[PDB]
Amino acid sequence: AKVHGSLARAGKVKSQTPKVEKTEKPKKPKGRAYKRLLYTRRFVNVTLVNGKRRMNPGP
Amino acid sequence: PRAPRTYSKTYSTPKRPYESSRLDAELKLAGEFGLKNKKEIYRISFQLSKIRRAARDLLTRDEKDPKRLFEGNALIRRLVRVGVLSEDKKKLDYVLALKVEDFLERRLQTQVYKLGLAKSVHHARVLITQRHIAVGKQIVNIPSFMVRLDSEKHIDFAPTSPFGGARPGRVARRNAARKAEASGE
Amino acid sequence: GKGKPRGLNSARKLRVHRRNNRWAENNYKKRLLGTAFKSSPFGGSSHAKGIVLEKLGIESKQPNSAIRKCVRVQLIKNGKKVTAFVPNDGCLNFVDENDEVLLAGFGRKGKAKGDIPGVRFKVVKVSGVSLLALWKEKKEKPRS
Amino acid sequence: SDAVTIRTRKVISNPLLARKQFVVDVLHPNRANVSKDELREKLAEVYKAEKDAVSVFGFRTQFGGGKSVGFGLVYNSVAEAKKFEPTYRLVRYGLAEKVEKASRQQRKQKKNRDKKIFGTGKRLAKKVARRNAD
Amino acid sequence: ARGPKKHLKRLAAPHHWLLDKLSGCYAPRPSAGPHKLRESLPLIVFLRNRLKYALNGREVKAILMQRHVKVDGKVRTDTTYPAGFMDVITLDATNENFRLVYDVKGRFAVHRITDEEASYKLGKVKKVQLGKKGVPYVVTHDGRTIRYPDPNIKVNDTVKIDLASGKITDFIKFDAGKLVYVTGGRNLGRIGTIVHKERHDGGFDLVHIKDSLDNTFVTRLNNVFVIGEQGKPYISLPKGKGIKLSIAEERDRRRAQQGL
RNA sequence: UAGUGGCCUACCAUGGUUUCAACGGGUAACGGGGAAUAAGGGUUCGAUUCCGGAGAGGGAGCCUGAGAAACGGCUACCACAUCCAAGGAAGGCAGCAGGCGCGCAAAUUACCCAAUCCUAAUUCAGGGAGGUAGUGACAAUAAAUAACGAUACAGGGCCCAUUCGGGUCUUGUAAUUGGAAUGAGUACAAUGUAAAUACCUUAACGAGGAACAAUUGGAGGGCAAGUCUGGUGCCAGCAGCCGCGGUAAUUCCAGCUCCAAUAGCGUAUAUUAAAGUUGUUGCAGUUAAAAAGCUCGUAGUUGAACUUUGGGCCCGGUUGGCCGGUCGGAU
Ligand SMILES: [K+]
Ligand SMILES: [Mg+2]
Ligand SMILES: [Mg+2]
Ligand SMILES: [Mg+2]
Ligand SMILES: [Mg+2]
Ligand SMILES: [Mg+2]
Ligand SMILES: [Mg+2]
Ligand SMILES: [Mg+2]
Ligand SMILES: [Mg+2]
Ligand SMILES: [Mg+2]
Ligand SMILES: [Mg+2]
């Protein structure tokens, strides 16, 4: 209805972010290797179930 | 204005994409057999589906029917040949009750591992793509290759390549050269 | 009986009855009248280029509160004036006036999305570059 | 260079074109490729001919090395091979030689200019002398 | 489309020539000649595809212009000459004589014959009527006009032909008990004895045909071709002899050959 | 007229089609083989590789010829456009390539008759038919991006069970160290080809993780994966839908971590299934949408029962037999 709203704040919060940079961490494998990595984590070693498996558990 | 060259999709994606029970059971198979993708599992589900469809369409027809007798035996022998279907089961009924792992167990990758040779499915994929293992005479660098039961004895390392015979590789021929020139003047 | 003719020689009635009742379906009626061509800004095409005339700050619908950033566009093919949403944070900065935009649909078969009143389209590209690419900062917005 | 070997399969006697035609299987372990000018002479030995009568073509190597199947044929005489073989095959052996054509565009272009010119074009070229000044 | 078509696309070819789909785009269009287009086999197909003598359509012309090959005792220089059923292809070099005859799948066989047999061919008589100056003639299936025939000869009878002369040596009446070659349909290439003929005025006559293993079948009279008496073929038949085995029975006869 | 026929002319009759939908209008309609989706039944698509038709800016006319109402033939008119010394002349890419325009929307003004076949007076000539390469993430197939040691370092299997834990059988994690394996690439030379190019083959050369470095989308629910950290404070923004955001944001912008599919993944529009939400199979109609105010009635659809039934014979068939006897087939 009101089409004449202020356009001034456009791009506020993207401009207001502190530009933290990505950590140069070691690269994970690709292809069949990564599917092996997933299988070891998910099934073989057995993650610490608190009733059920998590994935991405908190501290 | 050539003839059309035909082609076909070899797989089928599942209907509901985030079923947890499936996703677990799929990664079980990608682990056990050392498969790259879910697409490799989907490939075998699709081949099983065409087989099961074929058998269902014959079991509707009466026993002692030409098309049943002919194609039924042809389907059975074709499975028996690749060693998916065992020698005891040759009814047609038994080809219906036939799981996905019963195809996976006969591909090269696993059949290399199961005959010694590697020590792991993950090693076997390497050996195959690295052109080491060879079926009877010639090299096969396709892990998908379904071994045909009259070829399983004849699997060995190639006449070309190390392990089997021949020159001792690329890295060895550099690593032999560096130690040799260091020792000599 | 079940209120429909069952007779062996009743195929005519069954076929004709079903034809008449298919006009009650939404998709069928649109497909046969040819609404997509006749009305419909894009003329039954997935996308359309247009020229930005304006920048609009459309107040959102309730119970949300926001000024959603939009552009009044005139399409090259028809001359049909249309409002399009400019998605992602601070992407209205990239557009400017008299800049050629490629519009797309919003996802809802010509219905308005979310809380944005009267907006059935979105910007995809400005002056031949992707709004995604400009906002991830891969390409640069050209001189004109 | 071990073994080398050569073997002709599916040998048809062909009186019509006056040749023996056959599939040239080539069990070559621990090599890369026998050349065409190499198969010919080895086959000229077995079939008792000169190299100019022998022909060989279409040698696809096997995957993973070893064999290299192809197709070979041996005519009765040289004169018989010269008439029946295609020119392109003879050039590879070095019996015929490449006649130097122009490009197709030029031959075509030339033909279209000549379509304009009726007759031999002697009296036309005479009027060109008095075209600059009538 | 304005006038007659000079090409034929590879897919629109007769299936029974067994042309490969990829290598090409056109196929050899039979010239006008004795046999119908779809019922013929061009020489280029016979030489290149079936006997494997030529490798290209250039080599087929190289062979034809030497003046070796001759169809019914006369030399031909046309790559797409429409040779057909009962024709005798004679090569001078090799001294191989063949007769084109259908195997059971419904395709022309490589059927080598002796030089004696190559003297003649059979000819199904198509029409028999009175020509100019009252001279009667017959018309064979390969379109040969033959004048002054035996008045016993009626339509659908076969007629033995001398080739060199091109005269009626002998003929076979169409009746019950005669051996037959079926020259079209689902049962193209089968051989068998006539049982009875169904009439149907202003329509299509049908011919019930038993064979040696007691399998009846019906064809149209247009597809039938008399080739002798019961167990007395005038020509030599190919391997099989127009039997038609099941796909099962065929697969069992492979397992005999599989032993080696 | 090649020939049948209102095909046309003369004369005569008054017929011909239609609610079993004529006639008219629309079609973002060339038809078919087919394609997509597919429990069964269906629904949607088919400009497009084969077959048939029509057209060559729009109309009409016509010469030649067996064959054309031909357009890489002519003639005229209409529209558009080219050169001119202004008197005149020459035009037709819905062939190949290419350009402009149009637009969401699509390639080189390349090489060749070697293959496929076609034409001619014709083994030779010609062929942008056609083939070969270039461009090409349309779609489809296969399928790298690591593998294996040994100390290592958390343990978990069972056996010393002394409370020392023997590293017992091995499984993970360390920016810890080992020798191997390799085509991606570059490149002898062959092979390949009309000539190449590329595969295929192959000398020589070519992985140490900082490199030869996988992405695209998500992480409240639907839906697989975090009430972890920093920012903003109903703003910016997200959100197919439900909903988030007004100072601890599980949802926004980011970092970390994790999920999913992966050389692909997302978005838009259309379409199929899901849809028994088009219902023949197979829906619903008291009150959710919907039984005509009532009856008559033509087409349509539908329409009770009844007419040689039973009995006695006889002859060949096809499977299991019963002794399949050698675990397979025989009478
Ligand atoms: K979840
Ligand atoms: Mg045409
Ligand atoms: Mg149209
Ligand atoms: Mg079409
Ligand atoms: Mg159109
Ligand atoms: Mg035009
Ligand atoms: Mg025309
Ligand atoms: Mg015209
Ligand atoms: Mg033109
Ligand atoms: Mg033309
Ligand atoms: Mg309902």
Nearest of E169, E174, E160, E161 to residue E224 by alpha carbon: E174
Query: What is the distance between the alpha carbons of residues B178 and B138, in angstroms, rounded to a whole number?
Result: 33
The verdict on A14 touching C (C-beta cutoff 8 Å) is: yes
Peptide bond into C63 cis (omega under 30): yes
Beta bridge partners of residue E228, listed in sequence order: E179, E233
Query: What is the distance between the alpha carbons of residues E250 and E244, in angstroms, rounded to a whole number?
Result: 9
Nearest of E105, E111, E102, E124 to residue E39 by alpha carbon: E102
CA D76 to chain CA centroid, nearest Å: 18
Q: Which residues of A touch C57 (CB under 8 A)?
A: 2-7
Q: Distance of CA B42 to CAs B38, B48, B148, C118, E100, Å?
A: 6, 10, 22, 44, 51
Please report, as a single letter, which amino acid is at residue E199: R
Q: How many CB atoms lie within 10 A of CB D47?
A: 17
Q: Which two tokens stand for residue E14?
A: 């007769």
Which pairs count as long-range contacts for A5-9, CB under 8 Å and 24+ apart, including other chains?
A: A5/C56, A5/C57, A5/C58, A5/C59, A5/C67, A6/C57, A6/C67, A7/C55, A7/C57, A7/C67, A7/C69, A7/C92, A9/C67
Nearest of E177, E81, E167, E69 to residue E123 by alpha carbon: E167
- Core vs surface per residue D21-39: b (16+ CB within 10 A) or e: bbebbbebeebeebebeeb
The verdict on C107 touching A (C-beta cutoff 8 Å) is: no
Query: What is the distance between the alpha carbons of residues D77 and B117, in angstroms, rounded to a whole number?
Result: 55
Q: What are phi and psi of B122, to 5 degrees?
A: -70, -30
Task: Answer yes or no: is A53 CB < 7 A from strand F.
Answer: no
Task: Answer yes or no: is A12 CB < 7 A from strand F.
Answer: yes
DSSP state, residue E46: I
Query: What is the distance between the alpha carbons of residues E65 and E79, in angstroms, rounded to a whole number?
Result: 10
Q: Which two tokens stand for residue E81?
A: 């000459």
Query: What is the distance between the alpha carbons of residues E103 and E85, in angstroms, rounded to a whole number?
Result: 11
Nearest of E135, E134, E183 to residue E158 by alpha carbon: E183
Task: Answer yes or no: is A40 CB < 7 A from strand F.
Answer: yes
Q: Judge contact between E230 and E177, C-beta under 8 A.
A: yes
Query: What is the distance between the alpha carbons of residues E54 and B172, in angstroms, rounded to a whole number?
Result: 53
Q: Which two tokens stand for residue E132?
A: 């100019």
Helix (H) or strand (E) holding C132: helix C131-136
Tell how strand D7-14 and strand D54-61 pair up: unpaired
Q: Where in the sequence is the domain holding D86, given as residue range(s)?
A: 1-134
Cα dihedral value C80, C85, C86, C92, nearest 10 = 80
- From the number of C-beta atoms within 10 Å of its C-beta (0-12, 13-18, 19+), residue C40 rates as middle
Nearest of D30, D88, D33 to residue D55 by alpha carbon: D88
Tell how strand E127-130 and strand E168-172 pair up: unpaired
Sheet holding E97-99, edge to edge: E70-71, E88-90, E97-99, E112-113
Nearest of B76, B79, B81 to residue B148 by alpha carbon: B81
B185 in a domain, yes or no? Answer: yes
Helix (H) or strand (E) holding C94: helix C92-95
B100 in a domain, yes or no? Answer: yes
Residue appearing with tokens 């046999």: E35
Domain count, chain D: 1
C-alpha dihedral sign at D102, D106, D107, D108: positive
Nearest of D26, D20, D119 to residue D65 by alpha carbon: D26
Q: Which residues of A touch C93 (CB under 8 A)?
A: 10-11
Q: Which two tokens stand for residue B166?
A: 């021949």
Q: Please identify residues in chain E, positions 38-77, with a C-beta within 7 angstroms of any atom of strand F.
A: 44, 48, 56-58, 61-62, 65-66, 77
The verdict on A34 touching B (C-beta cutoff 8 Å) is: no
Q: How many CB atoms lie within 10 A of CB E114?
A: 9
Q: What nucleotide is nearest B143 when CA is compared to C1'?
A: F143
Query: What is the distance between the alpha carbons of residues B58 and B65, in angstroms, rounded to a whole number?
Result: 9
Tell how strand E206-210 and strand D7-14 pair up: unpaired
Q: Judge contact between E83 and E71, C-beta under 8 A.
A: yes
Query: What is the distance between the alpha carbons of residues B33 and B125, in angstroms, rounded to a whole number?
Result: 10
Alpha-carbon gap: A51 to the closest alpha carbon of chain B (Å):
16
Query: What is the distance between the alpha carbons of residues D4 and D1, in angstroms, rounded to a whole number?
Result: 7
Query: What is the distance between the alpha carbons of residues E88 and E136, in angstroms, rounded to a whole number?
Result: 27
- From the number of C-beta atoms within 10 Å of its C-beta (0-12, 13-18, 19+), residue E76 rates as middle
Convert chain D into a string of H (helix), E (strand) and C (coil). CCCCCCEEEEEEEECCCCEEEEEEECCECCCCCCCHHHHHHHHHHHHCCCCCCEEEEEEEECCCCECEEEEEEEECCHHHHHHHCCHHHHHHHCCCCCCCCCCHHHHHHHHHHHHHCCCCCCHHHHHHHCCCCC
Please report, as a single letter, which amino acid is at residue B182: A
**Integer distance in angstroms from the first to the last C-alpha of chain B?**
70
Check CB contact under 8 Å for E94 and D15: yes
Q: Where in the sequence is the domain holding B124, given as residue range(s)?
A: 17-185
Please report, as a single letter, which amino acid is at residue E111: H
Q: Judge contact between D117 and D124, C-beta under 8 A.
A: yes
Tell how strand C121-126 and strand C81-85 pair up: parallel
Phi-psi region of D123 (alpha: psi -120 to 50; beta: other; left: phi over 0): alpha
- From the number of C-beta atoms within 10 Å of its C-beta (0-12, 13-18, 19+), residue C129 rates as middle
CA B27 to chain CA centroid, nearest Å: 18
Q: Judge contact between C45 and C37, C-beta under 8 A.
A: no
Query: What is the distance between the alpha carbons of residues E223 and E36, in angstroms, rounded to a whole number?
Result: 14
Q: Judge contact between E168 and E146, C-beta under 8 A.
A: yes
Task: Answer yes or no: is B103 CB < 7 A from strand F.
Answer: no
Task: Answer yes or no: is A8 CB < 7 A from strand F.
Answer: no
Q: Judge contact between E49 and E17, C-beta under 8 A.
A: yes
Q: Distance of CA E245 to CAs D26, E17, E185, E208, E211, Å?
A: 41, 22, 17, 19, 12
Query: What is the distance between the alpha carbons of residues C36 and C57, in angstroms, rounded to a whole number?
Result: 28
The verdict on D16 touching E (C-beta cutoff 8 Å) is: yes
Query: What is the distance between the alpha carbons of residues E180 and E241, in angstroms, rounded to a whole number?
Result: 11
**Integer distance in angstroms from the first to the last C-alpha of chain D?**
79
Of A1, A7, A13, the CB nearest to C92: A7
Task: Answer yes or no: is C59 CB < 7 A from strand F.
Answer: no
Task: Answer yes or no: is B46 CB < 7 A from strand F.
Answer: no
Query: What is the distance between the alpha carbons of residues E212 and B169, in angstroms, rounded to a whole number?
Result: 68
Q: What nucleotide is nearest C23 when CA is compared to C1'?
A: F278
Q: Which two tokens stand for residue E225?
A: 């071709």
Q: Judge contact between C42 and C80, C-beta under 8 A.
A: no
Query: What is the distance between the alpha carbons of residues B98 and C12, in angstroms, rounded to a whole number?
Result: 48
Query: What is the distance between the alpha carbons of residues B47 and B82, in angstroms, rounded to a whole number?
Result: 13
Q: Which residues of D touch B134 (CB under 8 A)?
A: 64
Q: How many CB atoms lie within 10 A of CB B144?
A: 13
Cα-atom radius of gyration of chain D, to the nearest Å?
A: 25
Query: What is the distance between the alpha carbons of residues C19 and C4, in angstroms, rounded to a whole number?
Result: 14
Check CB contact under 8 Å for D12 and E68: no
B157 in a domain, yes or no? Answer: yes
DSSP state, residue B107: B
Q: What nucleotide is nearest E62 when CA is compared to C1'?
A: F123
- Core vs surface per residue C47-83: b (16+ CB within 10 A) or e: ebebebeebbbbbbbeeeeebbbbbbbebeeeebebb
Could you tell me the resolution of this structure in angstroms? Answer: 2.4
Sheet holding E217-220, edge to edge: E217-220, E206-210, E191-198, E179-182, E224-229, E232-233
Query: What is the distance between the alpha carbons of residues E40 and E78, in angstroms, rounded to a whole number?
Result: 14
Q: What residues contact residue D94 under an 8 Å CB cut-off, 6+ apart?
A: none
- Core vs surface per residue D61-87: b (16+ CB within 10 A) or e: ebebbbbbebbbbbbeeeeebeebbee
Q: What residues contact residue B91 under an 8 Å CB cut-off, 6+ apart?
A: none
Helix (H) or strand (E) holding B43: helix B39-59
Convert B116-182 into a string of H (helix), E (strand) and C (coil). CCCCCHHHHHHHHHCCCEEECCEECCCCCCECCCCCCCCEEECCCCCCCCCCCCCHHHHHHHHHHHH
Q: What are phi and psi of B37, to 5 degrees?
A: -130, 175
Distance E35 CA to ligand 2 centre (A): 25
Q: Which residues of A touch C117 (CB under 8 A)?
A: 1
Largest CA distance in chain D: 83
Distance C92 CA to ligand 4 centre (A): 46
Tell how strand D7-14 and strand B155-157 pair up: unpaired
Q: Judge contact between E87 and E99, C-beta under 8 A.
A: yes
B3 in a domain, yes or no? Answer: no
Q: Which two tokens stand for residue A30?
A: 């690709």
Query: What is the distance between the alpha carbons of residues B50 and B69, in angstroms, rounded to a whole number?
Result: 18
Per-residue DSSP letters for E194-228? EEEEE--TTS--EEEEE-TT---EEEEGGGEEEEE
The verdict on B134 touching D (C-beta cutoff 8 Å) is: yes
Query: What is the distance between the alpha carbons of residues E213 and E84, in angstroms, rounded to a whole number?
Result: 28
Q: Judge contact between D28 and D35, C-beta under 8 A.
A: no
Beta bridge partners of residue E171, listed in sequence order: E159
Distance C48 CA to ligand 5 centre (A): 20
Please report, as a single letter, which amino acid is at residue E129: Q
Residue appearing with tokens 């005038």: E234
Structure-solving method: cryo-EM
Nearest of B152, B116, B157, B122 to residue B138 by alpha carbon: B157
**Integer distance in angstroms from the first to the last C-alpha of chain E?**
56
